[PDB]
Amino acid sequence: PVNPKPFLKGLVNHRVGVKLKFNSTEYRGTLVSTDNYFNLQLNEAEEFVAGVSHGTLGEIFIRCNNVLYIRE
Amino acid sequence: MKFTPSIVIDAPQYYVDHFNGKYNVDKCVILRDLQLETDSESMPSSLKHLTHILDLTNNDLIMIPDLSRRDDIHTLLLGRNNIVEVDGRLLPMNVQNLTLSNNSIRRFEDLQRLRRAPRTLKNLTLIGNQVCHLANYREHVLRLVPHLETLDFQNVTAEERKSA
Amino acid sequence: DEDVAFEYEIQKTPQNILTWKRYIEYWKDKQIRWLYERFCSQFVTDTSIWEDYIRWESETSRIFWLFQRCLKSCVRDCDRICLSYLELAIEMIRHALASSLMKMEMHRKVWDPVIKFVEEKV
Amino acid sequence: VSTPELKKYMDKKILLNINGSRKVAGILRGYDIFLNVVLDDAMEINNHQLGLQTVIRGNSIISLEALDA
Amino acid sequence: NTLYVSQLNEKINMQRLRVNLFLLFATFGEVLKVSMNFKKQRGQAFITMRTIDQASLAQISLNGERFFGKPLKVEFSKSETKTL
Amino acid sequence: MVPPINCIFNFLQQQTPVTIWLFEQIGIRIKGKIVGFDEFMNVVIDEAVEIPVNSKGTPLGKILLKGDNITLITS
Amino acid sequence: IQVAHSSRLANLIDYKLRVLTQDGRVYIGQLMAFDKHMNLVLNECIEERVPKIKVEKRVLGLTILRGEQILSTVVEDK
Amino acid sequence: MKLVNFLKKLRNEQVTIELKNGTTVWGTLQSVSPQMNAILTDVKLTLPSDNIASLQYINIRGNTIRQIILPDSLNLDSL
Amino acid sequence: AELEELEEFEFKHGPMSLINDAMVTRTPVIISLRNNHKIIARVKAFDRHCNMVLENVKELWTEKKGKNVINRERFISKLFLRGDSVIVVLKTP
Amino acid sequence: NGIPVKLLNEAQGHIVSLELTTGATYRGKLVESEDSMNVQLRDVIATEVTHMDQIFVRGSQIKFIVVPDLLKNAPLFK
RNA sequence: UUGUUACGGACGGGAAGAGGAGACGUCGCGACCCUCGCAGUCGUUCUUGACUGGUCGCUUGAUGUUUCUUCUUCCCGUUC
């Protein structure tokens, strides 16, 4: 019943968790909007390098190709 | 005439020597029977174009002159020349296949430029000269030029090396 | 110096005049300009070599001097050099237009631009 | 657009060699233009079983030797 | 044009042999043939040249010349080469 | 014969157990149940647990795995 | 090295070009054909390895090169 | 629409580009394509600080070029 | 025309919106890369596939063997950074 | 259409060597060729050494495909 | 047709003494071997279809993956 793009849509204005393959760093923030090619935009972004944070970034944007997954 | 830049430019660099590499240059109207009496001047006009196979045979070249990088003239053919001495620091690693047949290399001491070959000349052959007729010449060559694999078509064996 | 080498090699043989181009494009520059001027003075009095000398010249005084140089010894490409001198003097357009009629007197459309300029001037 | 000729390899066991030093093996059931090979077996390498049928992505299938010629 | 060699050292390798041949024949004229066609070794090699004169010269001069121990038996080819 | 477009549909219908494999790290492999339907290989999967398999429980919710990053699917 | 001021891939057909690959292995070969992805058909391939100092050599192929892993081709000699 | 268009409009100007190997290579752009297939006339190379090991001509493929520099200090795209 | 023309406003709604905004009102942004890199610059142009053009480009990377961290720096300006290398961009206050 | 593809198609029933991203050099017969460069082989050797009966290869990850010296000028070009 | 745009101190090599090594392949220097010639082998029929330097040393030949863990003496070149 629940498809991917609709799930993604639902998850707008809510917390999102995303990770990368190259330089494994967990990005944590609240989602803003998405497009057909699955690029991302977050607010209140915290760059957790394997648990420990580098710094509170704020309003950020992420490309699709690097992203591993979307979680809570 | 003398080996100028214009002559080099003129030279037929179309038919590549298909045995190895590309661009088998023949300086002047024809390097075979060019009649370059002086040393090979204006080598910079070629500018390391190409084994290269710069066949400068049937000339009157007094001394062997080179001016290029480590991969610029591996299969150089200087047959039927008047090569007295071929000392130089430019062509160190490149010139492996040296066709120096029918040269004017008289003494064994004339090959002292090629001798002490561990650093002086990375590879060199030399054959068909007046120095080949001298007593214990091959042995001497073996002693000095260890890099010389093929000595006048026949190889430098282990036994030979031991002897020298 | 390679200038003496180029001059001796060019002097020992008239050898498909691009040897003067080898003396030119090596420095190309004032030495190349003087060498190409001596080349155009010595043997080659063609339109392409004079045009290359004018291209080496290419501020209105030098262009007018090159146009006076290309006015001398020009037979085949006369109307094209005439239109080129008209465009050069268009920036003494009337005197050089009469000089264009002198060098090349076929010349209807080129004279029509001077007539259009004379109409726009009024 | 053009279909890969995998009808020859139908009903034949295949020893695959996917990217990243992993030797998977299984019999071919279905195929497609993207090369997402629908195969009905999976035994990893020594040997041990981990689930029956396995559908694999097209990008991560490099080499595939047929067992039965 | 072509010159069929015979009676040479079979112990030497193919490419190397070819190279040697090339080196030898560059003094007379421009050697057209880059590699051997027969691939049998033991003397049988066809040295293809651009000019006939050059070939003739080669035949004259290198008849029974010491190349890798044995004397090479030079001779003119029966049929013309595929390249020529 | 089972084509991969209908495969997705079947998965959606059934909701079978799954063990998804990743590209970069060989050890860490995801486990859950596929739900969604899509033209691309990108599909949503509930109850995701990342297990370190030999050559033991990463906290993770209902995952949506990227279309280029799936190495294996099972049913 | 001699090479004239060429404009496009069509004008430089049938020339001995070097080719560089993603891993860093050097090639040489005469460019025979053209394609959308620059799958340049080499006339004779002499592949070369450099370990991660000095360049090695091989002589296996006379190949149809694929355009995915190519970095940048270089002209050797006409 | 696209910024390959921008690249296309540039002609006869030096630009450094850092490749996947990692070399600063200044060269003239020549006929730029929609696939970013650049061609450089004069260039400076470092085979795997930047060691000097330069060649004259080279034909670049578009997938490698990540950054470009020094066409000319000016921004214009739409026409 | 309309199939491509309707995609023009897709930047300002979706995930590129922030970058568009940045471009409009030039401000510094932190750009990351693949093989350990950190670039800082202000935005000027923008397109569909993240092939951006910037100004005042400060680079920070490492070319240190044997696990020693060395932060080298050099001023670059008016680049053309292709989208395949760009991972994360963000508008700072 | 692609000339290399055409060439490949033409060379059906010929001994063609290969090389992948990892560098596993094969050598055997060519079975079939398509628009996407998908190759299948028979009696195929493998020197990464083993001797394999058959193999199918994905087109995207191939580095280069070897062809013999026969199909050089004719009958593909003009 | 062709193009463009738009949609004395350092370093290197070789040798010796004291406390780099093993696999997988890929090309070479010797040969007691094979093989014998100018453009190879076999099927079938009076002229056509298919398939293509090998083996053994190296008595210290070259070279890419993949695991583990330097000092002294002499000789030859470059630099100050």
XYZ file of C-alpha atoms in Angstrom, chain G residues 21-23 25 27 32-35 39 41 43 47 60-66 68-69, chain J residues 2-5 7-8 17 19 21 37 59-67 69 72 77:
44
model
C 42.356 4.773 -18.032
C 40.751 5.356 -14.601
C 43.086 3.050 -12.604
C 47.300 2.144 -16.916
C 47.775 2.560 -23.626
C 40.157 3.507 -36.230
C 36.486 4.329 -35.462
C 34.245 6.781 -33.548
C 31.085 6.578 -31.388
C 34.524 3.918 -27.816
C 38.783 1.195 -31.734
C 44.501 -0.700 -34.193
C 49.022 -1.843 -22.433
C 47.867 -8.975 -26.029
C 45.141 -6.938 -27.763
C 44.147 -5.048 -30.900
C 41.103 -3.743 -29.130
C 37.723 -2.022 -29.201
C 38.091 0.299 -26.176
C 35.014 1.191 -24.067
C 33.361 4.541 -19.451
C 36.806 4.362 -17.783
C 27.899 2.981 -33.299
C 30.621 1.668 -35.622
C 32.328 -0.290 -32.843
C 29.058 -2.091 -32.131
C 32.294 -4.242 -35.885
C 31.572 -6.413 -32.850
C 40.021 -11.737 -25.518
C 39.475 -7.370 -19.663
C 37.538 -3.522 -14.047
C 28.007 -4.462 -25.337
C 28.813 -4.434 -20.823
C 29.214 -1.467 -18.446
C 32.160 -2.896 -16.441
C 34.319 -4.031 -19.427
C 37.606 -2.129 -19.867
C 38.322 -3.304 -23.439
C 37.367 -6.053 -25.932
C 40.041 -7.644 -28.174
C 39.543 -8.303 -31.927
C 43.750 -8.446 -37.318
C 40.579 -4.059 -40.195
C 33.800 0.875 -43.146
